[PDB]
Amino acid sequence: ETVPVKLKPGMDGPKVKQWPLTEEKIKALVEICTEMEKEGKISKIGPENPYNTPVFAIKKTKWRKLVDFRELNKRTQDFWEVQLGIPHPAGLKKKKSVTVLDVGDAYFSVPLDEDFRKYTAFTIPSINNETPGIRYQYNVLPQGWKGSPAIFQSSMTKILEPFRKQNPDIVIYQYMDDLYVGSDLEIGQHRTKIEELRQHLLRWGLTYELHPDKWTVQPIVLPEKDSWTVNDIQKLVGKLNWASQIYPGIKVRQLCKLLRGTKALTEVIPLTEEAELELAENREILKEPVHGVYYDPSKDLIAEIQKQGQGQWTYQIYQEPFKNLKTGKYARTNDVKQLTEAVQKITTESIVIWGKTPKFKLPIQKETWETWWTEYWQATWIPEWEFVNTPPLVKLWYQL
Amino acid sequence: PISPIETVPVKLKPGMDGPKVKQWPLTEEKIKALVEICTEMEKEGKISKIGPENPYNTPVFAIKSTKWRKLVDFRELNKRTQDFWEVQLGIPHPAGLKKKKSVTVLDVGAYFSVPLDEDFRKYTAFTIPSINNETPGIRYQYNVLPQGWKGSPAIFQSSMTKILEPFRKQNPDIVIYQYMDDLYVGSDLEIGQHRTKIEELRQHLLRWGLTTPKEPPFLWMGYELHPDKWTVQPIVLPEKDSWTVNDIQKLVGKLNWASQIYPGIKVRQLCKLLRGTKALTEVIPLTEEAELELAENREILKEPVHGVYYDPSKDLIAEIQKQGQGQWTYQIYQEPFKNLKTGKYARMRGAHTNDVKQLTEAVQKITTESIVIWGKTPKFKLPIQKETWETWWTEYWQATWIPEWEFVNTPPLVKLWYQLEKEPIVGAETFYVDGAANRETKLGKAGYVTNRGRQKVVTLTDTTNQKTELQAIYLALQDSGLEVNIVTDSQYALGIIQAQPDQSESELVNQIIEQLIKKEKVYLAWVPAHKGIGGNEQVDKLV
Ligand SMILES: Cc1cc(/C=C/C#N)cc(C)c1-n1c(=O)[nH]c2cnc(Nc3ccc(C#N)cc3)nc21
């Protein structure tokens, strides 16, 4: 039996353009999709279906299909969030180890409500448009649709019920096609418990280690110097003054007034009295979290990312600008590959902390990103993103 | 014949009923003409007549040579019909096709041979009105795909695809494509074995209710297809005494079309005349630049050029040359220098760019185009040194990545025309600059104070804060020596200048770029305004 699914009121199915695919990825999708069709998971459709969501091939050594249901997810957000929502446990971020398991194969056993299937249409393009794209819709719960875990919630609870009862201190959280399993066990016992869980899932047709406990803040750092030029203090005042917009308490005047008159930038300046001391307060202010910034569950998360050069990238997550919920860096063979890796890491952390993915403000030309991101993407979800032109010194203020 | 293919189910849009448009009365000639036309169509199964139970109706007309044409106006039905998947997502480009030995062309003259979903026919009802509109007219409905209905192209092409699929697997080495009333069938077989397999296809078409009774070069979609090469069908450039807007638009379209295979075509100077919306009939004198551009295009077009087809076993090489003033040109070949394709890139992405950003945007546009046409990115040969390119993208704040490339010494080379200093310049003067405009009056002041005691303030009319802040920086660069430190309060102007633009829509920004190139050293720094920061509050006073 199938759970009836409805779009948002007066909302139509997605009609999203397929991005061009290389021959190698087209050929991979074709073989994957013929095998799914012979197993009945998808079916060819005719022109009376005007819907489309995009599809790609990614890698784990063997190709895997990734459907971008971002648009559909938005147009079914009453179904998976306010009707069948999966609650997010505050305990998960406190655990010493969190293991992520793919459980998406679970969904291929559950049929999809036949009146919804047309909204899952997708196209395999052809090279040079020589042949009409191959067209398909889903017959089962598809991976990547936020409706799938919501409908499967009933069954996931029945699968996990023995393991949860026997391990009351382990937190198991489902997000899209993944299980997040967190314990305070020593790493060997934790791995052992993952193994037993794999065995529970294996009796129903279901076949990477985080340490949230060690996700330390990236505080705004201020230089410690022997001598201070005019230039040095100006950069310091600018950096403090921008910081003052997030951290109440930041003060700059004592530093400001040793810069009075119009002196050369190269002129060395000995610090004054509360001047040198205010570098102490200001330092003391900036190495601890923002007072009074709290997560609002009804608002979107935003992630901004700056390229710092030399393989390092800074990021901040917020809902209203300058009230950061989190700040960090990402460390260390291509600008796009590195950025693709930072996006996946930031999304995973924020699934763990809030059960929500952020919308990314990405410092890259749209077409470069869309042409390369799939060469390095390994997750089974896709966050929302948009393309931005990083303000010049925001990068200098988050520099280490 | 009406194909035995199964029908495509069709629905009206949710919440709507079929059309009920009233039939206007027509001339007796037009009623006679339509009874004749409809009686043949009824014999062949294309239409059926229906009682008055059916409440739906779509107007019908007839227009004339001595032919009479039926005209069913499906406007109301079309706006009540569901949407369909669209027919073509893109047109195959010739440069993506493979060499063919034999190419046949069967006649396949369409819609009236494909059945229409039984539950839908009633919405296609129409009425031949009686004379002087006194009795109720004769009422028909369609059984096939009606001409002019929204669903016909999509359902026809889908039907034509399922019919071909059997033959397309028993012959996975033969390509078949649909152009107008001809089907083009291509193989690497010789004429004997080729037209044997042509026969079995036509036999296979006949079994599905499709009748089939041209030599290269085939004229198609603007292109001229030959068995071993391809080009654009001939471009003739008029020799007008006088040019109208309309003539220049048609000429720009033709040069743009020719740029796919004729390398180095330029349209910038001709396009610049089309700016400032004026009448299509109005005459535009050609500037001397547009006449030199027109002259150059004519030499490029004097002798014919052709493109070669794609060899899937070899790499694609893409070459880009700078043609100047934001104009880029490129060729794609597999063996030098036999082009599959050429093109041009001439976009201003941004108000201010340099040649390095423009070259990367061009490589991005060529990369995407290669994926579409050939399914594969090419190897790039680019007029920029490897050192220039990694100096720029490592220091720059956006991410980028272009695929495999190699420097090629084809001048003009791409280079950064100046470099901002990394730290302040000992022994050079420090200017504290500042601009300001009054939002009411559009009046502003720009000026500086230096650590050496100088100071200047100019006044500005019809201006903005943004332009006074750039005016201040220009002031500083004029009055300083070969080395200079510049403190500004404008993130706006620092942002622009740190991106190392070498071109801009703003003549102000271009004048600053002029100055930055003559200088030997320039350090530029930013301070927040209104914090009483030494020289900045003091130059703030003046403006
Ligand atoms: C996209 C296309 C358009 C037309 C329009 C014709 C008209 N009018 C005809 C064909 C067969 C194809 N077509 C397709 O669908 N797959 C193909 C693979 N390779 C070739 N190559 C090729 C084609 C023609 C010649 C000639 N002369 C030489 C080489 N064409 C292909």
Q: Please report the residues numbered 158 through 197 in chain B whose beta carbons come closer than 8 angstroms to any beta carbon of chain A.
A: 158, 161, 175, 177
Whole domain around residue B520: which residue ranges? 430-542
Handedness of CA B199, B205, B211, B217 (dihedral sign): negative
Instruction: Ligand 1 pocket test: pick from B164, B177, B372 the residue with the most ligand atoms within 8 Å of its Cβ.
Output: B177
Amino acid (1-letter code) at residue B400: T
Q: B438: buried, middle or exposed (CB in 10 Å: 19+, 13-18, 0-12)? A: exposed
The contacts of residue B16 (CB under 8 Å, 6+ apart) are B80
The residues near B541 (Cβ < 8 Å, ≥ 6 apart) are none
Backbone angles phi, psi at B490, to 5 degrees: -95, 105
Residue B367 near residue B403, CB atoms below 8 Å:
yes
Task: Tell me the C-alpha distance between B330 and B179, whole Å.
Answer: 30
B226 C-beta closer than 6 A to ligand 1: yes
- DSSP 3-state of B438: strand
**Angle in degrees, CA B38, B41, B46, rounded to 5:** 125
Q: How far is the CA of A371 from the centre of ligand 1 (A)?
A: 28
How far is it, in rounded angstroms, from Cα A206 to Cα A203?
7
Give the span between the Cα atoms of B41 and B140, in whole angstroms.
Answer: 10
Q: Give me ligand 1 centre to Cα B184, in Å.
A: 7
Q: How many CB atoms lie within 10 A of CB B9?
A: 12
Q: How many CA atoms lie within 13 A of A189 on its CB side?
A: 8
Handedness of CA B383, B384, B386, B390 (dihedral sign): negative
From B482, B510, B517, B515, select the one nearest B496 (Cα to Cα): B510
Tokens of A136: 């398909």
Q: Which two tokens stand for residue A82?
A: 């306010």
Half-sphere exposure of B483 (CA within 13 A, CB side): 9
| Helix, strand counts (H, E) of chain B | 13, 23
Q: Phi and psi at residue A315, in whole multiples of 5°?
A: -150, 155
Cβ-based burial of A78 (10 A; exposed 0-12, middle 13-18, buried ≥19): middle
Tell the residue number behind the tokens 């009425």, with chain if given: B127
Q: Which residues contact B196 (CB under 8 A, 6 or more apart)?
A: none
CB atoms within 10 A of CB B86: 12
Residues preceding chain discontinuities in chain A with C to N over 2.5 Å: 60, 207, 332
**Pair B431, B485: CB distance under 8 Å:** yes
Distance, in Å, from the CA atom of B351 to the CA atom of B335, rounded to the nearest integer, reads 38
Provide the 8-state DSSP code for A248: T
CA–CA separation, A238 and B526 (whole Å): 8
Treating both helix axes as pointing N-terminal to C-terminal, what angle do B491-498 and B507-518 enclose, rounded to 10 degrees? 60
φ, ψ (nearest 5 deg) of residue B290: -60, -25
Nearest-angstrom CA–CA distance, B410 and B143: 64
Neighbouring-strand partners of residue A19: none
- Is the CB of residue B30 below 6 angstroms from any atom belonging to ligand 1? no
* Strands of B379-482, DSSP E: 379-382, 405-407, 430-438, 443-450, 455-460
Pocket-testing residue among B89, B101, B174, B184, ligand 1, by greatest number of atoms within 8 A of Cβ: B184
* Residue B233 to residue B181: CA distance in whole angstroms: 20
How far does CA B131 lie from the centroid of its chain?
Answer: 52
Burial class (CB in 10 A: 0-12, 13-18, 19+), B144: buried
- The 10 Å Cβ neighbour count of residue A223 is 10
Nearest to A239, CA basis, from A222, A258, A262: A222
Q: Which two three-digit tokens encode residue A124?
A: 């395999």
- Calculate how close chain B gets to A363, using CA atoms only, in Å: 5
Residue positions counted in chain B: 543
Contact criterion met (CB below 8 Å) for A391 and A320? no
Contacts of B449 (CB under 8 A, 6+ apart): A262, B431, B432, B455, B535, B538, B539, B542
Residue B495: which CATH number?
3.30.420.10
Q: Which phi and psi angles does B144 have, rounded to 5°?
A: -115, 180
3-state secondary structure of B2: coil
Alpha-helical runs (H) found in B288-403:
288-302, 355-374, 386-395
> A315 - beta bridge partners?
A305, A328
- Entry field: residues in chain A: 400
Can you read off the two tokens belonging to residue B343?
């093109």
| Surface-to-core class of residue B319, CB atoms within 10 Å of its CB (0-12 exposed, 13-18 middle, 19+ buried) | buried
Q: Do B368 and A260 touch (CB under 8 A)?
A: no
Place of tokens 């026919």: B121
Q: What is d(CA B78, CA A96) in angstroms, rounded to the nearest whole number? A: 62
The Cα B267–Cα B247 span in angstroms is: 14
Asked whether B534 and A262 are in contact (CB, 8 A), the reply is yes
- How many Cα atoms are found within 13 Å in the side-chain-facing hemisphere of A62? 2
What is the CA angle A330-A333-A337, rounded to 5?
60
User: Do residues A50 and B155 make contact, with C-beta atoms less than 8 angstroms apart?
Assistant: no
CA–CA distance, B127 with A223 (Å, rounded to integer): 87
CB contact under 8 Å between A336 and B401, yes or no, is: yes
Closest residue on chain A to B392 (Cα): A309
Q: Which residues contact B39 (CB under 8 A, 6 or more apart)?
A: none
Residue B288 to residues A250, B272, B274: CA-CA distances in angstroms? 62, 12, 15
DSSP state of A133: P
DSSP letter at A258 equals T
Task: Name residues whose C-beta falls within 8 Å of residue B263's C-beta, 6 or more positions apart in sequence.
Answer: B300, B305, B329, B331, B339, B342
Binding residues of A for Mg(2+): 102, 177-178
Rounded to the nearest whole angstrom, what is the distance from the C-alpha of residue B12 to the centroid of ligand 1?
A: 37
Q: For ligand 1, what atom is nearest to the CA of residue B186?
A: 11
Under 8 Å between Cβ of B247 and B283:
no
Question: How deeply is B415 buried, as exposed, middle or buried, from its count of CB atoms within 10 A (0-12, 13-18, 19+)?
Answer: middle
Beta bridge partners of A327: A316
Other CB atoms within a 10 A radius of the CB of residue A243 amount to 19
| Strand duo A171-175 + A178-183: pairing | antiparallel
Residue B20 tokens, joined: 């009920």
3-class state of residue B360 by DSSP: helix
Contact A336, A344 (CB under 8 A): no
Alpha carbon distances (Å) from B255 to B249, B258, B264, B268, B447? 10, 5, 10, 11, 48
**Looking at B188-273, which runs of residues are DSSP E strands?**
218-220, 223-225, 230-232
CA-CA distance, B489 to B487, in Å (whole number)?
7
Query: b vs e for B341-361, b when ≥16 Cβ sit within 10 Å of the residue's Cβ?
Result: bbbbbbeeebebbbbbbbbbb
Do residues B195 and B105 make contact, with C-beta atoms less than 8 angstroms apart? no
- 3-state SS, residue A4: coil
Of A20, A24, A128, the CB nearest to B96: A128
Picking from B82, B375, B491, the nearest residue to A23 by CB comes out as B375
Resolution (A): 2.6
Which tokens in the block code for residue B54? Answer: 């059916």
Helix (H) and strand (E) counts in chain A: 11, 14
B469 marked among binding-site residues: yes
For B235, other C-beta atoms within 10 Å of its C-beta total 17
Sign of CA dihedral A67, A71, A75, A77: positive
The atom of ligand 1 lying closest to the CA of B226 is 27
CA gap B337, B353 in Å, rounded: 31
* Buried-state track A264-297, b at ≥16 Cβ within 10 A, e below 16: bbbbebebeeebeebbeebeebbeeebeeeeeee
Report the C-alpha gap between B116 and B151 in whole angstroms: 10
Phi, psi of B73 (to 5 degrees): -90, 95
A236 to each of A156, A228, A315, B425, how far by Cα in Å? 54, 10, 21, 19
* d(C-alpha A78, C-alpha A115), whole Å: 17
Contact status of B523 with chain A (Cβ, < 8 Å): yes
Of A18, A50, A129, the CB nearest to B84: A50
Residue B183: enclosing H or E segment and its boundaries?
strand B182-187
How far is the C-alpha of A330 from the C-alpha of A340, rounded, in Å?
11
SS3 of A232, please?
Answer: helix
- Cis amide linkage into residue A4, ω under 30° from 0: no
The secondary structure element, H or E, covering residue B48 is strand B47-49
* Contact residues, A window 99-118, toward B, CB-based 8 Å cutoff: none
Q: Sort out which chain B residues have CB atoms less than 8 A from A20's CB and list them.
A: 368, 371-372
Please classify residue B181 by burial: count the beta carbons closer than 10 Å to its beta carbon, then call 0-12 exposed, 13-18 middle and 19+ buried. Answer: exposed
Helix (H, G, I), strand (E, B) or coil at A192: helix
To test the pocket of ligand 1, the residue of B89, B91, B100, B231 to mutate (highest count of ligand atoms within 8 Å of its CB) is B100
Local structure of A147: helix, strand or coil: helix
Enumerate the H helices of B375-525 as residue ranges.
386-395, 465-479, 491-498, 507-518
Residue A25: count of CB within 10 angstroms of its CB = 22
Query: From which experimental method does this structure derive?
Result: X-ray
Locate A126 and state its tokens.
């052809």
Question: Does residue B148 sit at the A interface (CB-CB below 8 Å)?
Answer: no
- Is the CB of residue A269 less than 8 Å away from at least one CB of chain B? no
Is any ligand 1 atom within 6 A of the Cβ of residue A130? yes
Six token digits for residue B399: 């991410």
DSSP B11-44: -BPTT----BPPPPP--HHHHHHHHHHHHHHHHT
Between β-strands B379-382 and B405-407, what pairing exists: parallel, antiparallel or unpaired?
parallel
The minimum CA-CA distance between B288 and chain A, rounded to whole Å, is 37
Here the contacts of A392-396 (C-beta below 8 Å, separation 24 or greater) are A392/B397, A392/B491, A392/B494, A392/B495, A392/B498, A392/B526, A393/A238, A393/A242, A393/B491, A393/B494, A393/B526, A394/A242, A394/A304, A394/A306, A395/A306, A395/A307, A395/A308, A395/A314, A395/B397, A396/A235, A396/A239
Atom of ligand 1 nearest to the CA of B217: 27
Pick from A353, A335, A364, A51: nearest CA to B83:
A51
Rounded CA-CA distance A341/B116 in Å is: 52
Task: Identify the residue among B89, B356, B391, B425 best suited for mutation to test binding to A, counting A beta carbons within 10 A and taking the highest.
Answer: B89
In angstroms, the CA B260 to CA B231 distance is 9
Q: What is the residue-wise DSSP string for A341-379?
A: HHHHHHHHHHHHHHS-PPEEEESB-HHHHHHHGGGT---
Distance CA A150, CA B31 (A): 62
Query: In angstroms, how far is CA B419 from the centroid of its own chain?
Result: 36
Helix (H) or strand (E) holding A396: helix A394-398
Q: Is the CB of B94 under 6 A from ligand 1?
A: no
Q: Is B186 in the pocket of ligand 1 (CB under 6 A)?
A: yes
Tell if the CB–CB gap between B398 and A21 is shorter than 8 Å.
no
Long-range contacts of B17-22 (CB under 8 A, 24+ apart): B17/B80, B18/B55, B18/B56, B18/B77, B18/B80, B18/B122, B18/B123, B19/B56, B19/B57, B19/B58, B19/B76, B19/B77, B19/B80, B19/B123, B20/B55, B20/B56, B20/B57, B21/B57, B21/B58, B21/B59, B21/B73, B21/B76, B22/B57, B22/B59
Q: Measure the CA–CA gap between A149 and A141, rounded to whole angstroms.
A: 9
Q: Does A263 touch chain B (CB under 8 A)?
A: yes
Find out whether A85 and A187 touch, Cβ atoms under 8 Å: no
Tell how strand B483-488 and strand B430-438 pair up.
parallel
Distance, CA of A332 to CA of A388 (rounded, Å): 22
Chain discontinuities in chain B, listed by preceding residue (C to N exceeding 2.5 Å)? 64, 109, 213
